[PDB]
Amino acid sequence: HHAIYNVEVETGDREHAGTDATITIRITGAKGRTDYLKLDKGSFEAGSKEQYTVQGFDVGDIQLIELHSDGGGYWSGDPDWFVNRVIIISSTQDRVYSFPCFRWVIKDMVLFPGEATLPFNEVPAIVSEQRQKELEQRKLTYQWDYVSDDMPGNIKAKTHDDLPRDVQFTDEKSRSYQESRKAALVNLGIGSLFTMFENWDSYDDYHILYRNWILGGTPNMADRWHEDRWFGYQFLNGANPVILTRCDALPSNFPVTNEHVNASLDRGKNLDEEIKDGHIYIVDFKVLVGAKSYGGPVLEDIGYKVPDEADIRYCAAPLALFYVNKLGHLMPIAIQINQEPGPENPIWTPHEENEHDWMMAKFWLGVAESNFHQLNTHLLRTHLTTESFALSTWRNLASAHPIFKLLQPHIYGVLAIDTIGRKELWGSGGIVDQSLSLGGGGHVTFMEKCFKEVNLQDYHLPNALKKRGVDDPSKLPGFYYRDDGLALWEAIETFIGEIIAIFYKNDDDVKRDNEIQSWIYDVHKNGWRVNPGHQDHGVPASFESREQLKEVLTSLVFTFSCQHAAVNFSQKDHYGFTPNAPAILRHPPPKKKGEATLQSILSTLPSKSQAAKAIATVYILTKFSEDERYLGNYSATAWEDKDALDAINRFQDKLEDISKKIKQRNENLEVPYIYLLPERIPNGTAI
Numbered sequence: 001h002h003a004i005y006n007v008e009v010e011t012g013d014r015e016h017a018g019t020d021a022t023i024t025i026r027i028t029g030a031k032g033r034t035d036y037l038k039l040d041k042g043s044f045e046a047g048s049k050e051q052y053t054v055q056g057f058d059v060g061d062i063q064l065i066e067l068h069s070d071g072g073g074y075w076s077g078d079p080d081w082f083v084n085r086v087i088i089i090s091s092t093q094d095r096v097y098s099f100p101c102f103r104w105v106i107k108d109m110v111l112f113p114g115e116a117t118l119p120f121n122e123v124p125a126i127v128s129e130q131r132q133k134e135l136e137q138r139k140l141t142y143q144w145d146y147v148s149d150d151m152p153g154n155i156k157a158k159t160h161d162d163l164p165r166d167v168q169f170t171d172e173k174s175r176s177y178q179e180s181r182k183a184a185l186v187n188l189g190i191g192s193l194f195t196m197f198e199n200w201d202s203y204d205d206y207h208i209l210y211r212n213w214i215l216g217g218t219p220n221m222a223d224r225w226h227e228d229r230w231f232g233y234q235f236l237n238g239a240n241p242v243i244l245t246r247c248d249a250l251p252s253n254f255p256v257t258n259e260h261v262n263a264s265l266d267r268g269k270n271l272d273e274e275i276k277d278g279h280i281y282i283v284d285f286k287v288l289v290g291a292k293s294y295g296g297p298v299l300e301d302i303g304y305k306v307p308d309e310a311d312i313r314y315c316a317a318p319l320a321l322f323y324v325n326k327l328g329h330l331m332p333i334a335i336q337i338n339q340e341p342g343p344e345n346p347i348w349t350p351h352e353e354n355e356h357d358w359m360m361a362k363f364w365l366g367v368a369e370s371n372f373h374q375l376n377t378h379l380l381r382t383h384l385t386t387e388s389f390a391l392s393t394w395r396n397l398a399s400a401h402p403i404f405k406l407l408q409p410h411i412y413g414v415l416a417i418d419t420i421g422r423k424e425l426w427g428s429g430g431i432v433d434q435s436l437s438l439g440g441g442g443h444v445t446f447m448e449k450c451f452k453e454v455n456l457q458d459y460h461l462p463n464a465l466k467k468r469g470v471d472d473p474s475k476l477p478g479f480y481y482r483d484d485g486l487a488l489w490e491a492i493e494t495f496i497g498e499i500i501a502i503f504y505k506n507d508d509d510v511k512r513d514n515e516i517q518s519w520i521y522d523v524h525k526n527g528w529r530v531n532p533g534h535q536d537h538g539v540p541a542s543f544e545s546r547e548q549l550k551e552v553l554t555s556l557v558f559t560f561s562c563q564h565a566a567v568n569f570s571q572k573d574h575y576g577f578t579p580n581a582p583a584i585l586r587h588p589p590p591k592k593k594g595e596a597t598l599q600s601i602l603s604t605l606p607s608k609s610q611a612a613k614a615i616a617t618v619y620i621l622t623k624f625s626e627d628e629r630y631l632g633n634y635s636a637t638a639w640e641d642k643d644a645l646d647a648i649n650r651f652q653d654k655l656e657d658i659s660k661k662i663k664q665r666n667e668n669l670e671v672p673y674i675y676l677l678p679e680r681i682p683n684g685t686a687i
């Protein structure tokens, strides 16, 4: 004759989560559906758990609910309502129904009870219809847009506030970001006054520049940047640990011989023998040829052609050779500043007659490294490329889908920061233009050039390390990015495998899942588009197995969290003392040996205000928000399935073990490697 429904609603704790809109709820089940019933006694504050008792038609077994908000009245400041979950008990049913949400309620929100499902799993027809309608609507809200033909697809949004609220920064992240921008302007202005009439005449002058910033500690390379051992160390454990490969033969255009490097070898063998023993490594920045730097110079194979106080910046495409010495230290042993060898682009070594020439060579290798790292390793290959997958998750996976639930905490952030970044950070005029040689426009062309070579197999850490020849700790010791990254790769892969096995019982279940198929196909066709001049991007058009699904999800999750953390949060230590890693140089490279002086070097190195702006950029890009959730913290995820909860438990406990092992390893290091501690790795790419 009627049922009594006990309704409990948990509102999210985040700022503005609450609402004063009038809320109603309609309940549907096997027997029919109630009317919209008022939940209108008391307030919905952030963090609240509020209870209601409403009476209506007995729907029998409950199958879905619909919340409605009237959107507030004249005085409502922020009617949008963030709902974590609704729990209902019906007087006629011996069951507790739990409806996870974790999304913003704007006007209407449909929710289903119980565990995640694949689209073909058996559910009431009205559930399947609502699921199909959700996804129709996703496609109108979440649309592809592109910087150019040669960039990965991004979310269509003019500014951050045009984004769907589910993918905007939380108010806490927007405050953390806007406050960081204000603090940077204040610290720049105070440091500008303090240093205004400073005679800039030594490398140690640059130490002033980080002193009035809250960076979490003096840059850990400030005291040792000038030592070859610590210069070499950072190609393993600094901000850009992705380019060094094992050298099994010198490139024909980098004609280093035993006579150039023998004074550096110290295990009793010559250069050819050390190459065969796997102790010789190399970096090749050839991708930077053709790069257009601010003020006009265009990099050639030979460097630059024989050209008041204009802002003119330079870069380089060097090769550099390194050697693992008998103590296990990676030492820099040769640098050629540009690609085409000869007298005007010679090989520089730590044994230069003129010590300033070797220091200048190391600075040219750093400028190439900085521009490559910021634009390719960090901006393109974390943010801009994984942004396509975040967009495709919203377009193609229903909120009921288990892989939607898995990805939510990891995709969060990237749409918001990238929408902001296109306007304020690496877009035209942004803080990047003030701080990189390739700023001014050349930085977009350069990312385009890099994106043409991008392949999804690059995001597979064990395969990429093996491919680079850097995975054998007996030949290449002291490589903590590799050690910690591989431990976390395995932990994430194990977890994802266990989630997949709960919902997909065999390969057929993958092939039949039209949403996961649409998801990968959307990236394949519209996300990482193989356009004229592009290599294949390694994105499959479909999934055929559980293992293939695991491998793509692991790559993606590991990149959003760990890889971004390793190449982003390492920036204070890498760049905070400018001479450790200059990102702008002001004169072209030398065309003969014996020229460099401390003074010609200081005039090539960034100006005080260029260096200050680099520090400011790093400060902004590396600020953790006070609401950040770190790796494995799934406190705001929508899981209900008991087995999924247990898989999460095992994963968190694994992460906890990896954390203690990293801290134990660190206690014996001269310079602890902390960027891959789980407690410092955000779930996502949000800054």
Ligand SMILES: [Ca+2]
Pocket: 016, 017, 018, 019, 078, 079, 080, 081, 082
């Ligand atoms: Ca609100």
Ligand SMILES: [Ca+2]
Pocket: 041, 042, 043, 050, 051
């Ligand atoms: Ca109440």
Ligand SMILES: [Ca+2]
Pocket: 645, 648, 649
């Ligand atoms: Ca738990």
Ligand SMILES: [Cl-]
Pocket: 033, 034, 035, 055, 056, 057
């Ligand atoms: Cl009713």
Ligand SMILES: [Cl-]
Pocket: 114, 115, 116, 405, 638, 639, 640, 641, 644
């Ligand atoms: Cl679930």
Ligand SMILES: [Fe+2]
Pocket: 378, 383, 564, 568, 621, 685, 686, 687
């Ligand atoms: Fe970032």
